[PDB]
Amino acid sequence: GSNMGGGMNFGAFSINPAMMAAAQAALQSSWGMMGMLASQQNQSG
Amino acid sequence: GSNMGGGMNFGAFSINPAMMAAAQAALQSSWGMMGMLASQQNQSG
Amino acid sequence: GSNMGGGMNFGAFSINPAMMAAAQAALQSSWGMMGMLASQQNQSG
Amino acid sequence: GSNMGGGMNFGAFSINPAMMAAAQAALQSSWGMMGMLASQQNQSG
Amino acid sequence: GSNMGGGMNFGAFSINPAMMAAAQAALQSSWGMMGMLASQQNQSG
Amino acid sequence: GSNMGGGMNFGAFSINPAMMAAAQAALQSSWGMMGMLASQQNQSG
Amino acid sequence: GSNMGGGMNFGAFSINPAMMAAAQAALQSSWGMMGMLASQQNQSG
Amino acid sequence: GSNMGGGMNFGAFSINPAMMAAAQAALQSSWGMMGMLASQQNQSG
Amino acid sequence: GSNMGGGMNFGAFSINPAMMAAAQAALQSSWGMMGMLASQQNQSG
Amino acid sequence: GSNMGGGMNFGAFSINPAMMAAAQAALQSSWGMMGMLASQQNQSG
Amino acid sequence: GSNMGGGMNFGAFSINPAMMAAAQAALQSSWGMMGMLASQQNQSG
Amino acid sequence: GSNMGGGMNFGAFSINPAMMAAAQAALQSSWGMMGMLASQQNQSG
Amino acid sequence: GSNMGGGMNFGAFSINPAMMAAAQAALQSSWGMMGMLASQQNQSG
Amino acid sequence: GSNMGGGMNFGAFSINPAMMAAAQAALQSSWGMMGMLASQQNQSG
Amino acid sequence: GSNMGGGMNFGAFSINPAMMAAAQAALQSSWGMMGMLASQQNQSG
Amino acid sequence: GSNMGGGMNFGAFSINPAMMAAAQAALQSSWGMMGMLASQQNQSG
Amino acid sequence: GSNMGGGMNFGAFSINPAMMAAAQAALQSSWGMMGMLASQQNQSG
Amino acid sequence: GSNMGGGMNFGAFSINPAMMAAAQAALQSSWGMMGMLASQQNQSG
């Protein structure tokens, strides 16, 4: 169980990610102030 | 069970992601202030 | 069970994602202030 | 069971996603202030 | 169980990541002020 | 169980990572003020 | 004559008082955003 | 004549008082964002 | 005549007082963002 | 006549007082961001 | 007439007073960011 | 007439007073960022 | 062609202009939250 | 063509201009949160 | 073409201009949070 | 073409200009948080 | 083309200019947190 | 083209300019945290 502390940002975040994912399995996520992503990908051989 | 603290942002976030995903499995998500995505992708071989 | 804290944003978010997903399985989502997406995609081989 | 905190946004969100999804399975969603999407797509091989 | 302390940022973060991931398994994530990602990927040989 | 202390940054962080990962297993993450990523990848031979 | 300044609260107040008063004289009051109570109780001996 | 300045709270106050008063004279009050209580209790001996 | 300056709080106050008062005279008050209480209790001997 | 200057708090105050007062005269008060209490208690012997 | 200067606190105050007062005269007060208490208690012998 | 200068604290004050006062006259006060208490107690013999 | 950005005010504006204009040409305007006045006055000599 | 950025004010503006204009040409304007005035006055000699 | 950045003010602006203009040409303007005034006055001799 | 960066002020600006302009050409402007004034005055001799 | 960087002020600016301009050409401007004034005055002899 | 770096001031600026300008051409400007003034005045002889 992870634990994190609260934070307030009044500043001007500018994020410019650009992505291109091609794989047997691929996931892409982009977010701003807050987010929570749990992605388990099991590929059997 | 994850735990996260609350946060207030008064600043001007500018996010410019751009995406293009082509894979056997592919997922794409983009969001702003808040979000929660649980994606488990199991591809058997 | 995930846990997240509340947040108030008075600032001007500008998100400009652009997407194009072509895969055996593909999902696309885009959202603003709040959202919750649970996508499990199991592709058997 | 996910848990999320409430948030009030008085700011001017501008989201400009643009999408084009062509795959064996494809889903597309776009939303503004709030939303909840549960999409499980199982494609047997 | 991880433990983290709260932090307030009033400064102007500018992040410019750019990504391109192609592998047997691939995941991509980008975020701004806060986030929590738990991705376990087990690929059997 | 890790323990970390809280920190407030008023300064202008400018991060310019650029990435390109292609491996049997690959993960990519980029973030700004705060984040927590637990990625265990076990590839059997 | 008391003087007070106006205040606007957009946040989520949660008050959980619980009371049990038994005395020769007893008064109980509970209120939310605004209120004004003038209670003078003179018990002669 | 008291003088007070106005204040705006956007944050999430959580007050959890719990009370139990038994005395020759007893008064109990609980309130949230604003209030004004003038209670003079004179008990002669 | 008291004089006070105005203040704005965007942070998450958490007050957890708990009380139990039993005396010849007793008063109890609990409040959140703002309040003004003038209680004069004269008990003659 | 007292004079005080205005103050803005964006931080997370956590106050945990706990009280129990039993005396010939007793008063109890607890408050958060702002307050003004004038209590004169004269007990003649 | 007292004079005080204004102050802004963005940090996380944590106050944990705990009290128990039993005397011929007793007063108890606890407060957070701001407050003003004038208590004159004259007990004649 | 006292004179004081203004001060801004961004740091994490942690105060842990604990009190227990029993006397012919007793007063107890605890506060955080700002406060002003004028208590004159005259006990004639 | 002028360009201006949108703004939301929740605060208590108090404007107390007072005017008295006597000239060969004279115009007087007073307004609150929003307004747009284009007055061209050409007086030939 | 002028360009301006948007701004949100939650604070208590108090403007107390007072005016008295007597000239061959005279214009007077007073406004609060927002406004746009284009006044060209050409007086030939 | 001028360019300006957006700004949010939560503080208590108090402006007390007072004016009195008497000239061959005279203009007077007073404003609060935002405004844009283009006044070209050409007086030929 | 001028370029300016955005700024957020939470502090209490107090401006007390006072003006009195009498000239062949005269302009007077007073403003608070933001403004943009382009005044070209050409007086031929 | 001028270039300027963004700045955030949480402190209490107190400006007390006072002006009185009488000339063949005269302009007066006073402002607080932000402003942009382009005044070209050409007086031919 | 001038270039300037961003700066954040949390301190209490107190500026007390006082002006009185009488000349063939005269301009007066006073400002607080930020400003940009381009005044070219060409007086032919």
From Swiss-Prot, chains A, B, C, D, E, F, G, H, I, J, K, L, M, N, O, P, Q, R:
| Processing and modification events after translation | Hyperphosphorylated in hippocampus, neocortex, and spinal cord from individuals affected with ALS and FTLDU. Phosphorylated upon cellular stress.
Variant or mutagenesis effect after changing A12T: In ALS10; triggers mitochondrial DNA release into the cytosol, which is then detected by CGAS, leading to activation of the cGAS-STING pathway and autoinflammation; slight reduction in interaction with PPIA/CYPA
Tissue expression notes = Ubiquitously expressed. In particular, expression is high in pancreas, placenta, lung, genital tract and spleen.
Effect of mutating G45V: In ALS10; loss of interaction with PPIA/CYPA
Where are the membrane-spanning stretches? none
Instruction: Give compartment(s).
Output: Nucleus; Cytoplasm; Cytoplasm, Stress granule; Mitochondrion
Pathology linked to this chain's protein: Amyotrophic lateral sclerosis 10: A neurodegenerative disorder affecting upper motor neurons in the brain and lower motor neurons in the brain stem and spinal cord, resulting in fatal paralysis. Sensory abnormalities are absent. The pathologic hallmarks of the disease include pallor of the corticospinal tract due to loss of motor neurons, presence of ubiquitin-positive inclusions within surviving motor neurons, and deposition of pathologic aggregates. The etiology of amyotrophic lateral sclerosis is likely to be multifactorial, involving both genetic and environmental factors.
Question: What does the UniProt record say this protein does?
Answer: RNA-binding protein that is involved in various steps of RNA biogenesis and processing. Preferentially binds, via its two RNA recognition motifs RRM1 and RRM2, to GU-repeats on RNA molecules predominantly localized within long introns and in the 3'UTR of mRNAs. In turn, regulates the splicing of many non-coding and protein-coding RNAs including proteins involved in neuronal survival, as well as mRNAs that encode proteins relevant for neurodegenerative diseases. Plays a role in maintaining mitochondrial homeostasis by regulating the processing of mitochondrial transcripts.
- Could you give the subunit structure recorded for this chain? Homodimer. Homooligomer (via its N-terminal domain). Interacts with BRDT. Binds specifically to pyrimidine-rich motifs of TAR DNA and to single stranded TG repeated sequences. Binds to RNA, specifically to UG repeated sequences with a minimum of six contiguous repeats. Interacts with ATXN2; the interaction is RNA-dependent. Interacts with MATR3. Interacts with UBQLN2. Interacts with HNRNPA2B1. Interacts with ZNF106. Interacts with CNOT7/CAF1. Interacts with CRY2.
Q: What is known of its domains?
A: Consists of an N-terminal domain (NTD) and two tandem RNA recognition motifs, RRM1 and RRM2, followed by a C-terminal glycine-rich region.
Quote the protein name from its UniProt record: TAR DNA-binding protein 43
List the lineage, top down.
Eukaryota, Metazoa, Chordata, Craniata, Vertebrata
Segment of the intact protein contained = 304 to 348 of 414
